[PDB]
Ligand binder design. Structure first.
Ligand SMILES: Nc1ncnc2c1ncn2[C@@H]1O[C@H](COP(=O)(O)OP(=O)(O)O)[C@@H](O)[C@H]1O
Ligand SMILES: Nc1ncnc2c1ncn2[C@@H]1O[C@H](COP(=O)(O)OP(=O)(O)O)[C@@H](O)[C@H]1O
Ligand SMILES: OC[C@H]1O[C@H](O)[C@H](O)[C@@H](O)[C@@H]1O
Ligand SMILES: OC[C@H]1O[C@H](O)[C@H](O)[C@@H](O)[C@@H]1O
Lengths: 343, 343
């Protein structure tokens, strides 16, 4: 049995799948965090090696035989490649783990799970990113620069607009579009501080990007219960997300438009659980972005969700990096959830 | 002889002025940081006592003779109610230091040095902030929230605009108002990196707020040398600083608009060195904002810079606090660099 493995990590979820020669998924094991910014490359190496061994036991596979390849689909933030270093520390500490390594990106590992010839992903999790891989080599992207330089339409951004808007309102630097009450109270309560000064501590001493972006869930709840300000912030995240697509539009190979689905857009990230709250902003940004840019027309799009971990894409790409091609059941890996054709 | 002290503290450099009954300066001593975050409060207490005693000795005043008052003008604003405590530990440990104390914001100390009545303090350094002090002493503000949640029109905000605009241009998420070329080259040079990926380490792993805000100076040169885009960023900075004034306007005591000087606005910070580049933006924001809000006065304003320590202001406030009006040469204390009367 020749085994190929993929890893999903870098963000909040971490996971390993192992795949056989024939593309049959052998086992899945969940793991501890592999965000290399919060944890070092020492721990990263440790949790990856545990994860894979546990999965090997689970699959009924020879514990001593090294993986043919291991495809690591990781949300970089900075591809400052210490991904190079991760591979080096990996083959240094555990030489029996795998014969070969591939570090890719979360976007490329997702795309790889859904289609055999590239496509388009829109990511909205704690951060955001939009990426494209054409049927030929060509790649292209918009805005995966993290929290200090963009992330428009992410959980961070939704959270940041939320506090930015109350700060500016009280200050009289800008008038809010709708009442400040619910969010102002949600804020103080979530961060457990009485006033605006209390919020500074969480920004510059503490700073917990994870806690901060968590605030998005409270805006989502408030929006669901009809608080206009909350509904507003989710509309604008819809636009920002829609704009990422508009941005990459000129770079898309025309054949990707010309099917029954039309342009398939893979939607990765938990913010998409609030799709109903993003829908209008998203539809708007696209609708105004096809007047300004292209009479060279795509007629429709459909949105898709993954049904297996991006680790499956990882495994796929890890095999591709060596000799092999892993068979893939692309119908099973992703499903349609929304469709729209411009009228 | 009655003697009246002030301290400019809270930042990295401290100062003490001993002022006599008819306003002449008796002694002055420099000191290091008096920031309780960086140093703890005990060390702050020690260093204040040390500075003041060194000022007494210079003046031929024994350590056992207390001041009639001491006005501590303490930056690191907003959260300066560790002041009640710094005063207690002071009159606990060193009872002969002073017979009276006043904790002042750095803004209150600052204006009290330039004019007798209230005014506005407008800061644009690494960060930015705007504080209004009324004739009656009541103080309020706009901004001061730091690089993650405002600092509009500061050194940091300027550098950040520069690199955001070019990031969004290459991404095609937002077309720049003017050509990206000059600034793009300035960026790559200043952070000494090959590409955008290289800028990302300077924002996450190797982050240095001071280094990053330093990039402002480069945009100043660009704007000086004639580059359309660098000029534009400095116009927007001017606007944001303008809008800080517009924010507090509704709170100003009408009588503050009434001098021959009009509204006194003290400018603190190094970005003010680029006044020529902020001027148009500053004016445009003041024009369209004083119109929105019925201009029942606000006929004019003059912008000032300081020429003495805010400690002089501190001395003055400490003395008023105990019923003594300290003679104060406001002309020697600060100079006016611009005057504008709306027409
Ligand atoms: N229903 C929801 N609506 C909007 N945001 C959500 C929802 N559930 C989770 N989130 C946000 O998802 C973010 C985490 O993104 P996720 O894709 O789960 O992980 P990561 O992006 O870190 O890999 C959290 O910051 C949280 O606020
Ligand atoms: N001539 C200038 N024009 C514009 N910005 C400047 C100039 N000189 C210095 N700066 C900016 O001022 C910032 C430092 O501000 P300063 O007021 O001196 O100290 P701080 O704000 O840290 O107390 C630096 O980030 C620098 O980029
Ligand atoms: O996860 C979505 C995005 O979050 C952040 O912006 C990261 O810099 C980027 O690599 C990631 O893809
Ligand atoms: O120094 C200018 C300003 O910079 C930062 O924004 C600080 O939060 C603020 O308190 C300070 O006054």
């Amino acid at each position: 049995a020749a085994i190929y493995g993929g890893v999903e990590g870098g963000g909040t979820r971490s996971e390993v799948l192992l795949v056989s020669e024939d593309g049959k998924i052998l086992a899945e094991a969940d793991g501890l965090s592999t965000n290399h910014w919060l944890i070092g490359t020492d721990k990263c190496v440790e949790r990856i090696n545990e994860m894979v061994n546990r999965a090997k036991r689970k699959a009924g596979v020879d514990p001593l035989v090294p993986l043919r390849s291991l495809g690591l689909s990781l949300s970089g933030g900075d591809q400052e490649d210490a991904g190079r270093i991760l591979i080096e520390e990996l083959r240094d500490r555990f030489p029996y783990l795998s014969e070969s390594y591939l570090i890719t990106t979360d976007a490329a590992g997702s795309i790889a799970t859904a289609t055999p010839d590239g496509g388009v992903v829109l990511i909205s999790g704690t951060g955001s990113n939009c990426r494209l891989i054409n049927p030929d080599g060509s790649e292209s992207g918009c805005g995966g620069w993290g929290h200090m330089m963009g992330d428009e339409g992410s959980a961070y951004w939704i959270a940041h607009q939320a506090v930015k808007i109350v700060f500016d309102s009280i200050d009289n630097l800008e008038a809010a579009p709708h009442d400040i009450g619910y969010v102002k109270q949600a804020m103080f309560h979530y961060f457990q501080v009485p006033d605006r000064l209390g919020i500074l501590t969480h920004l510059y001493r503490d700073f917990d990007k994870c806690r901060f972006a968590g605030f998005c869930r409270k805006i989502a709840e408030g929006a669901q219960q009809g608080d206009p300000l909350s509904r507003y912030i989710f509309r604008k995240a819809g636009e920002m997300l829609g704009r990422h697509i508009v941005a990459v539009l000129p770079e898309i190979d025309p054949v990707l438009f010309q099917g029954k689905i039309g342009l398939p857009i893979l939607c990765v990230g938990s913010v998409w659980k609030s799709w109903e709250l993003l829908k209008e902003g998203f539809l708007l940004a696209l609708t105004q972005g096809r007047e300004i840019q292209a009479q060279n027309f795509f007629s429709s799009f459909t949105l898709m969700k993954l049904r297996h971990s991006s680790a499956l894409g990882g495994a796929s790409l890890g095999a591709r990096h060596i000799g092999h091609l892993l068979p893939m059941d692309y119908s099973a890996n992703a499903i349609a959830f929304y469709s729209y054709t411009f009228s």
